[PDB]
RNA sequence: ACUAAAAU
């Protein structure tokens, strides 16, 4: 009687793909108790012996952390005791999917478990929740033989999956502890501060009766970024600067506008001196004729952050709307996983096949055919985070199929994919240096020689401008007029969604799957408003909250604190510290901060008294 | 001890007064020309020296400045960058020096990059002008050829932040 | 009715 090996994946699609690859096409499908996760059975060999294989799915986190008992009711608790007094338990996530019962009825007699879960911290946490759900119901492992395995993989290619199955390992318990510590920290701090603020403000100001004033280790800095930008806008004093432009003529027809090397003179008298020192001259000489070949460099692979940035900038989508559209595309099978964190293609990827699947679309059929004929250019080397393969098209589509926003996102994704395997845009930049009196001027222009990926991303295109005249050193030209232009320093504008996403990526605030959620949350809590151009304008609520936080304890808003706490969490993820020690040493610090905040709330009170 | 010392100061470039020269530490039978200069680089020209620039440099009538002179820097501002970011890569550096002989203030503008005067140069630093120096409107053109920084600290605070 | 992340 052969044994059974139970394999678990983070997604039904991932489980189906892995089971198909490892089955060599011999797969049997059944539907489980939940109705979404499926069970795939196939015969094979695991440890030098015949054995059945039962591959199944877990839809994300099995369990979610929450307070147990009365402490989940706001009217019968003091938020101050949410820190070191309220017990916390992992109850469930999506209880309509009886995931614990499904795992128990699937692993009733399984002798081995192989965790084909995502290779990240959240993946390891679900590994251990699957383990403490299935290990009680597995058959006893007599002897020293190991009964738990983990598979490390990045791509869903045949040979990658096969070799990952060949070389198996053991789960890391410290990473699960790191995730659990992060969850406890976030839950306790956020729920304590939000409960206090909501119960306080709703009791004094009537205009916030139905509002939810929420504080969090990831949305408060997000609001702080926009509030800081608004502060810069409101505290900007324009300055007046003068620029000299000289217009020369060469071929009796073309007039060249010459730019000043000593640009942006900020003193009227100095600018007038330069004008009086130049305009009395009717001849300009040529000194430098630089004709240098350069190349505009092709894009990397598409990660979720870049996709959200481009969707917010050019496609006119919100981050959450873009995430929903990408998820719909992925479920329908047109796009790869849209929550990827990697800009590097796998070393073993069917780039040629993916391009060949796009060889019958009128927008880029010619470009794809020429690229396949001349051979693809190797994609740029990027960063391999070991999370997921980058967002790539997987099936052909047309406006008649998707329609609207889904079609636009698919078009951008496939154009980016064609561009990342195309040639660089080679352009010659010609600069001519002129001497007028004792002062210098320069004229620069660009002429394309090989459009490259410009053919498939027309918008990353070098502008078409007339080539600079062929004048060598010592040639004299007549200058029509030299004029001084008065200009003012424009004020910066409110943060765009792309810039906010860039700032969140830079400062470590949020993740690949939480940036749209955080932006939508700060928009929905009426902290910021989305104006024209996807600009985030802070509201009076956001301004008063962030300014009062600065007055009381700015360390609750500063972006660096999330990174510092993450560093102390990796301290125990690497085993160099203790889970309980770090948990307590952060909780007590934040408890002292919360008590100081409660004792010093008069700052925000008097700051909000004027504006409600 | 007086006339020959004044001749030495004139040859060096300084055009102080007799009271200022005797104010610069000149211990009898001790030091003649080096230590007086050494302390002059560290003492206020406004309180020590005599006028030698023309009457109306800023007016515009003056077209050239002749003779090797020495002046005191009072303020240095980057006129190619805004006040909020006094240092920036948007425009080439261009410093609007304010210079004094102790009686009359004048303004100097830098054409060529001068790796001897920066925004970190302390006020009171002495600049020696050599040869003919052009003035265009009210501004003295300064380059690497006609300017030499002689250093010096005149006991001035930070005057910043 | 919170905080943060995984999932369709
Ligand atoms: Mn995952
Ligand atoms: Mn991630």
Residue numbers in the entry:
A (entry chain A): 0 to 611
B (entry chain B): 1 to 161
List sentences from the manuscript.
Yet, RNA complexes of TopoIA have not been previously visualized. We obtained RNA pre-cleavage and rejoining complexes of TOP3B. To obtain DNA- and RNA-bound TOP3B prior to cleavage, we substituted the nucleophile Y336, which forms tyrosyl-phosphate covalent bond with cleaved DNA, with a phenylalanine (F), to disable nucleic acid cleavage while preserving the DNA/RNA interactions. We prepared the cryo-EM sample by mixing cTOP3B-Y336F with DNA/RNA gap substrates in equimolar concentrations, and resolved the DNA and RNA complexes at an overall ~3.3 Å resolution revealing rigid components including protein and single-stranded nucleic acid fragments. As for ssDNA, TOP3B interacts with the ssRNA backbone through its charged amino-acid side chains, divalent-cation cofactors, and alpha-helix dipole moments. The backbone and base geometries of ssRNA and ssDNA are similar, with ssRNA establishing more backbone interactions. We observed that in the ssRNA bound to TOP3B structure, the upstream and downstream phosphate groups and bases are closer to the central scissile phosphate than those in ssDNA. Consequently, TOP3B exhibits a more compact structure with ssRNA than ssDNA, suggesting conformational flexibility upon binding to RNA or DNA. The catalytic sites of TOP3B are superimposable in the pre-cleavage DNA and RNA complexes, indicating a common mechanism employed by TOP3B for cleaving DNA and RNA.
Type IA topoisomerases (TopoIAs) are present in all living organisms. They resolve DNA/RNA catenanes, knots and supercoils by breaking and rejoining single-stranded DNA/RNA segments and allowing the passage of another nucleic acid segment through the break. Topoisomerase III-β (TOP3B), the only RNA topoisomerase in metazoans, promotes R-loop disassembly and translation of mRNAs. We present a series of cryo-EM structures of human TOP3B with its cofactor TDRD3 during cleavage and rejoining of DNA or RNA, thus elucidating the roles of divalent metal ions and key enzyme residues in each step of the catalytic cycle.
